[PDB]
Amino acid sequence: EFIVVAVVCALFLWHVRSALVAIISLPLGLCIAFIVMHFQGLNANIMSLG
Amino acid sequence: SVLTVLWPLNKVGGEFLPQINEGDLLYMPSTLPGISAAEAASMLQKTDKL
Amino acid sequence: ILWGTGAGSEVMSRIAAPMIGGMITAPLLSLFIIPAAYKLMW
Amino acid sequence: IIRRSVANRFLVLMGALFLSIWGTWTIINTPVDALPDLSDVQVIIKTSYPGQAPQIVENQVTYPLTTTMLSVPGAKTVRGFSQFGDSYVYVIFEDGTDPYWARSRVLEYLNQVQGKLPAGVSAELGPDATGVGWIYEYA
Amino acid sequence: YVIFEDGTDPYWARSRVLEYLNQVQGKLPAGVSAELGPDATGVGWIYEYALVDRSGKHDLADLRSLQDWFLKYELKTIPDVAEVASVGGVVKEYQVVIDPQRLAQYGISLAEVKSALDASNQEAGGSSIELAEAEYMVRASGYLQTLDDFNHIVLKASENGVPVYLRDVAKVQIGPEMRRGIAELNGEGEVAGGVVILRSGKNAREVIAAVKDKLETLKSSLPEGVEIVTTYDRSQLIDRAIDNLSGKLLE
Amino acid sequence: IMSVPEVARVFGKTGKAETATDSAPLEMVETTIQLKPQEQWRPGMTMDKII
Amino acid sequence: EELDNTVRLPGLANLWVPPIRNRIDMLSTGIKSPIGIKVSGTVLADIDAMAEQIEEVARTVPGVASALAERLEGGRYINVEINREKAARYGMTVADVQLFVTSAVGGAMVGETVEGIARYPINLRYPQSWRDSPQALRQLPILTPMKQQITLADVADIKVSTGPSMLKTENARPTSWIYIDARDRDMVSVVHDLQKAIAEKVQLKPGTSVAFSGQFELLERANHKLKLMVPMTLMIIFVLLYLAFRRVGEALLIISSVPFALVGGIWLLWWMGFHLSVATGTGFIALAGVAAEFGVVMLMY
Amino acid sequence: VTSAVGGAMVGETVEGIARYPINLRYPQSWRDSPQALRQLPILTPMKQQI
Ligand SMILES: [Cu+]
Ligand SMILES: [Cu+]
């Protein structure tokens, strides 16, 4: 998803550290969600992952 | 264009939520109240061969 | 996610589809109905 | 309002790697399961009789067991299966009641019941796992 | 009564006390059961109601019974009601009265009577047997359920016999279990009813409302010439307090 | 108590009543007295004048 | 398909489920059947006899209501009714008659032997040969307190009879839960008319109450709570719609704007074959969120 | 002094989800007064009547 995303961006920006921007942009957002579930417990069931 | 969706929203195909796939399968029937313990261990071996 | 599933994607589809179909539909919406609606709103 | 964060681009990055080191360890160590616990919240009170019948398994044991239970706090339903041999009673609480608190409460009136049932009968507090709990089956 | 400092988690509380209750069960006699109090505080008593009969048709003993197994069960279902206390009435009691001359004549000791009594009101089974393909469960009669049945109990039995029947040493009649609490309504007379109790800290108003909705529904299933008179309804003071102050503030 | 024209319903409990709260012998007479609303039935006569 | 077709046998209706969901399935003491009527009763006779009244009524009250009072009763039993009078003449405590019905006939374990951290049980019974059939059982040899040698038939009448395979109960009282249900229609309208209908011409026996359950109890809380949430969610939304540019004209327009997008979205479902579940609703939510974003950023332009 | 004089219950009979108690005592007449009670009839292990 990230590379395809990045590939598409590259084409619409004729390449760029967009991928780098992507690793910052979404992985951290994923990370905060991973933290928050832990706060209120919950299980990493398929949907939480889904 | 919205009318075109109202058609689908009123009919909405059918069925709700998903029945998820797990790599294995559980077989459970509607079985009849009374049977021999002998017949049970039998009508299970056969079932485990079919 | 829509044309393949090793394990546990029967669910994602249901939530995914609305995006694609709605996303061929949502941008188009934006292209056209910000102006028409703004000049009509005044 | 955003600009107050650019006078220190280092901050958000160092902040960011706070998230990096922290990120990697919270996400990885945590429990992974397929599906969510969702039987409900309950205590599985099983009783065991070697051989008998439903009239007698209910009359003899699950009557003593369901009836004392109506009175325990949090009880929504005191419904149970009674049958040839065994008598399972299921007790239900509202969602999200602390599960351990839960089972502790139900236990309250279990002691009152032990003396009222026969010798061959032992009233057993369910396991700790939910129905989902069954993992590794081996033969 | 066991007491803790203020504000100890009430449920934690009762849980701790319970700890040593199990140690005690085996040390007291059979007739004795140690009971953990209800969940509500003394304040808890909310909706008091009485169970009267409009006529004579329905028996005093029959009412306590009506309130005990049918009602108390209907009203313990409502969300926040802890336990529903039964008051008054008469407890139907199967009563075997021995006669000192009859005992002497047959030489059957009291111990002899008690031993058979305990020994003739039980029901049991014995596995299944593979007749046909299905296995049939094996059971056997044994419960009491006929006064005549109480009579035909055996005590002194003999071969090429004749035997002594309990009917030969006692008169078995249904009676009124020694009373330990008597509920009454006016001159209307002795009448059994039940008190409702509110599991600590839960909107009394709401619980009662639920109860009043249950009783309206039940009167449908009630017998002939009997009704549920409310003897007391905490709810009203709840109301009277609210209306009074709600009106004040506007003013 | 019923004679009193102010009182509405009355309930007589002379003992304990199937709750682990009520710890009352049979001499312990505890009657709940429902009092009729106050448009009925009297002038003067206050809660304390009633007692 | 292949499997369900492969394994066919009598009395066996085949159901196939995945592990997790199945094991979950047996504990949750739930009544799947959208609707279901719990009929509480003091004695079994009342509730069951009444339970059949509900088979006919569910069928008549408009709705494909499949009604089954009880699939339960299906056990086969041997009834040893002990004749107290005929046992008395032999001075036998019914308890002792039973001793032959319990330890001898069946075989309740009478103790367990230790072999260190191990404990196997000890069974004490009459041979197979005297338990083979009701007849074999009518001649059960009972040795009286007076060494009077006899057969079980002398002390009791052993018949055969069908009975309860299992007993379910709601709160110490025996209640039969009928499973009545139509599909894909919110059966909220089907319940009330039915409940009054039964009340008008079919009567309940004294010492009995009736209640409904299943899914029906569910929606009324969910649906109702959802419906409330659409005002709540919209009111908090409008406030946050005209906050960037100040005026409500745009907030009006966003609301007009989203449904179109949803439209193009749902239409995809037909294309691929996907059905609408809460999962599609969640999808839809994502769609509405993304379009609202552009509305805002695009309005500024 | 217990079962005969007073009347401790010696068992309860079932009538389904119901349970009424069984009382076993000497008649009223032999419990009327201390005197009535001084003549309580006790039948000894040796059929000695007293
Ligand atoms: Cu008092
Ligand atoms: Cu006879």
Q: How far is C6 from chain G (nearest CA, A)?
A: 15
Cβ separation G266–B8 shorter than 8 A:
yes
User: Is residue G124 within 8 Å of G107, Cβ to Cβ?
Assistant: yes
Q: Which residue do the tokens 């002094």 mark? A: H1
Nearest Cα residue in chain H from E169: H26
Angstrom distance (rounded) from CA C1 to CA G262: 20
DSSP for D17-54 reads HHHHHHHHHHHHHS-B-SS---S-SEEEEEEB-SS--H
Q: How far is G270 from chain D (nearest CA, A)?
A: 27
| Coil/strand/helix, residue G59 | helix
| Coil/strand/helix, residue A9 | helix
Q: Compute, in angstroms, the gap from residue F18 CA to the centroid of ligand 1.
A: 14
Instruction: Give the CA count within 13 Å in the CB-facing half-sphere of G150.
Output: 19
Instruction: Give the CA count within 13 Å in the CB-facing half-sphere of G151.
Output: 12
Q: Which residue do the tokens 């609202």 mark? A: G292
Structure tokens, D76: 């929504």
**What are E124's strand-pairing partners?**
E140
Q: Compute, in angstroms, the gap from residue G85 CA to the centroid of ligand 2.
A: 7
Q: Compute, in angstroms, the gap from residue F23 CA to the centroid of ligand 1.
A: 8
Q: How far is E17 from chain H (nearest CA, A)?
A: 30
CB of B42 less than 8 A from some CB of G = no
* DSSP structural state of residue H34: H
Task: Say which of B12, B28, B31 has its CB closest to residue G17.
Answer: B28
Instruction: Give the CA count within 13 Å in the CB-facing half-sphere of E36.
Output: 29
Amino acid at F28: M
Q: How far is A17 from chain C (nearest CA, A)?
A: 26
Angstrom distance (rounded) from CA E86 to CA E71: 10
Instruction: Give the CA count within 13 Å in the CB-facing half-sphere of E166.
Output: 29
Residue G268: how many other CB atoms lie within 10 Å: 22
Partners for A (CB, 8 Å, 3+ pairs)? C, D
Angstrom distance (rounded) from CA G265 to CA G285: 11
Stated as kind and residue range, the H or E segment containing G288 is helix G278-300
Which H, E and C letters describe G60-95, residue by residue? HCCCCCCCCCCCCCCEEEEEEEECHHHHHCCCCCHH
User: Is residue G47 within 8 Å of G176, Cβ to Cβ?
Assistant: yes
Interface probe, candidates B35, B36, B42, B43, chain E, greatest E C-beta count within 10 A: B36
- Residues in contact with C30: Cβ distance below 8 Å, sequence separation at least 6, in sequence order: G291, G294, G295, G298
Q: Compute, in angstroms, the gap from residue E99 CA to the centroid of ligand 2.
A: 21
Angstrom distance (rounded) from CA G188 to CA B17: 21
Angstrom distance (rounded) from CA E215 to CA G143: 57
Angstrom distance (rounded) from CA E212 to CA E233: 10
Whether omega before F41 lies within 30 degrees of 0, making that bond cis, reads yes
CA–CA distances in Å: residue D39 to residues B48, D43, G21, G184, G215: 29, 11, 9, 24, 15
Q: Compute, in angstroms, the gap from residue F27 CA to the centroid of ligand 1.
A: 9
Residues of E in contact with F21 (CB under 8 A): 37-38, 40, 42, 44-45, 85, 197
- Residues in contact with G183: Cβ distance below 8 Å, sequence separation at least 6, in sequence order: G34, G64
Say if residue G276 is exposed, middle or buried (CB neighbours under 10 Å; 0-12, 13-18, 19+): buried
Q: How far is D29 from chain E (nearest CA, A)?
A: 32
Q: Which residue do the tokens 């939520």 mark? A: B17
| Coil/strand/helix, residue E185 | strand
Angstrom distance (rounded) from CA G154 to CA F43: 82
Q: Could you say which ligand is closest to the alpha carbon of residue F27?
A: 1
**What are F31's strand-pairing partners?**
F12
Angstrom distance (rounded) from CA E250 to CA G147: 93
Angstrom distance (rounded) from CA H23 to CA E174: 10
Q: Compute, in angstroms, the gap from residue F25 CA to the centroid of ligand 1.
A: 9
Residues in chain C: 42
Among C16, C22, G280, smallest CA distance to B12 is for: G280
Strand ranges (E), E62-199: 81-87, 92-98, 124-129, 136-140, 154-157, 163-165, 170-176, 183-185, 189-190, 193-198
Angstrom distance (rounded) from CA E223 to CA E115: 40
* DSSP structural state of residue G34: S
Instruction: Give the CA count within 13 Å in the CB-facing half-sphere of G206.
Output: 8
User: Is residue E21 within 8 Å of D113, Cβ to Cβ?
Assistant: no
Among E67, E73, E74, smallest CA distance to E88 is for: E67
- R_g of chain C computed on alpha carbons: 16
DSSP for G134-171 reads HHHHHT-EEE-TT--EEEHHHHEEEEEEEE-SEEEEES
Among B32, E131, D82, E143, smallest CA distance to G159 is for: E131
| Coil/strand/helix, residue G251 | helix
Q: How far is G209 from chain H (nearest CA, A)?
A: 15
Structure tokens, G27: 């504990």
Q: Could you say which ligand is closest to the alpha carbon of residue F16?
A: 1
Q: Where are the alpha helices (DSSP H) in E76-202?
A: 100-106, 110-117, 147-151
Residues of B in contact with C14 (CB under 8 A): 18
Structure tokens, D23: 């990120």
CB of B24 less than 8 A from some CB of E = no
Cβ separation H17–G174 shorter than 8 A:
yes
Q: Compute, in angstroms, the gap from residue E66 CA to the centroid of ligand 1.
A: 26
Among C29, C40, C21, smallest CA distance to G295 is for: C29
Amino acid at A16: V
Angstrom distance (rounded) from CA G278 to CA G182: 21
Chains E and C touch (3+ CB pairs under 8 A): no
CA–CA distances in Å: residue E216 to residues C13, E76, E84: 50, 16, 17
CB of D34 less than 8 A from some CB of A = yes
CA–CA distances in Å: residue F28 to residues E9, F7, F22: 33, 21, 10
| Coil/strand/helix, residue B18 | coil
Cβ separation H11–E121 shorter than 8 A:
yes
